[PDB]
Amino acid sequence: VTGDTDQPIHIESDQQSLDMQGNVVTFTGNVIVTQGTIKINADKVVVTRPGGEQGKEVIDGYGKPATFYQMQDNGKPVEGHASQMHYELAKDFVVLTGNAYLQQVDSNIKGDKITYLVKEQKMQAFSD
Amino acid sequence: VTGDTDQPIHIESDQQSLDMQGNVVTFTGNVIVTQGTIKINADKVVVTRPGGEQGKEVIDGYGKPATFYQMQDNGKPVEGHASQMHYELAKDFVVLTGNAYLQQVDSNIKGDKITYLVKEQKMQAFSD
Amino acid sequence: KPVPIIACNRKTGKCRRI
Amino acid sequence: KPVPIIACNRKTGKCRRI
């Protein structure tokens, strides 16, 4: 949604490894990256800030698959998955690579029980 | 899609077992059930054929969550998840139970690399 | 008509009608 | 325009900017 890329980025994981040079952090184990409505899930996320320059951070997520979610302004979420998610913060895009897939969700329902017909239903009509 | 329910059912799993009589077949370990474009994923799948009567099979899938996919003739895939998937072959429908969820997908793309614009700007303010 | 159900074991590669 | 990046350790609940 508008404003997502102005939001703080929160990255939670089971293990974290902070390189002594201060420009690379590696997250492993059920990593979840959130930024507004953006959500990336991955087994491993590497955050780099080249040369310590704020605003040029790069986020790479790796999974089998890694997943991506975001709500759009038009009210329909986008979902996708790939071996890798690549998000340079200074750009306006995420790049999915390796058996990549992306989709828009048009509608949903939820309940304790859902039934769904696996055969197509034919037109029901009759004359007198 | 039309014709899915006329297709053979394929089941893949890490382990398989039988009850003593042989009319309950249990699959465990990343079980994948396909029938044409129908695909069910679960940790455990139980296939029951009461009395050994062909056509009377029931497929139950359990997971955290179990998942469901099918392509529809209209070109929109249907996807969902629940704690259990119940598919009685003689019937025209599947039953999702336990925090069940079902969605329709109206646009989707596939490739080695997909680039997706995460920055929207539906409104913008200028103090100038 | 009843459809066949074929199970494959992922460890052995062996398949069989069930 | 740069946004904060917060690292959170699931094991302990502890978080901080990186």
Side-chain angles (χ1 to χ4, degrees), chain A residues 37-63 65-68:
Chain A
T37 77
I38 298 160
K39 196 174 91 173
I40 290 172
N41 289 79
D43 289 322
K44 177 159 101 202
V45 171
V46 186
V47 183
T48 311
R49 180 177 297 138
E53 195 186 341
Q54 300 268 313
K56 316 207 127 213
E57 298 85 358
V58 174
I59 296 175
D60 289 294
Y62 305 90
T67 69
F68 173 87

Side-chain angles (χ1 to χ4, degrees), chain A residues 25-37:
Chain A
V25 177
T26 298
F27 299 82
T28 59
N30 186 22
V31 179
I32 302 167
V33 175
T34 61
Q35 193 195 8
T37 77

Side-chain angles (χ1 to χ4, degrees), chain B residues 14-63 65-81:
Chain B
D14 294 340
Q15 327 267 315
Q16 281 120 302
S17 55
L18 271 185
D19 73 332
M20 269 190 52
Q21 174 99 300
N23 297 326
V24 180
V25 193
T26 297
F27 305 88
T28 69
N30 185 22
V31 191
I32 302 157
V33 177
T34 62
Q35 182 179 35
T37 77
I38 298 166
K39 183 190 280 173
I40 290 181
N41 283 272
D43 290 323
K44 176 167 100 193
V45 169
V46 182
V47 181
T48 293
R49 195 185 274 125
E53 184 178 19
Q54 310 252 337
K56 296 319 262 153
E57 298 91 357
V58 187
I59 304 193
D60 287 289
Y62 306 89
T67 66
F68 174 85
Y69 174 99
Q70 185 186 27
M71 175 59 70
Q72 303 179 101
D73 280 352
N74 67 14
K76 295 191 280 243
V78 172
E79 295 174 346
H81 53 88

Side-chain angles (χ1 to χ4, degrees), chain C residues 2-15:
Chain C
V3 304
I5 306 180
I6 300 135
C8 298
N9 180 324
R10 180 176 291 110
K11 323 279 136 193
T12 82
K14 295 198 190 83
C15 307

